[PDB]
Amino acid sequence: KLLKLLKKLLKLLK
């Protein structure tokens, strides 16, 4: 789902 996609993109900045 596109909700877990937000966590997959978060590790690219945090």
Side-chain angles (χ1 to χ4, degrees):
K1 299 181 180 181
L2 303 178
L3 164 64
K4 180 175 180 179
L5 174 62
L6 304 180
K7 284 65 169 62
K8 179 177 296 183
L9 296 171
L10 175 150
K11 60 175 60 179
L12 307 179
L13 171 65
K14 304 301 182 63

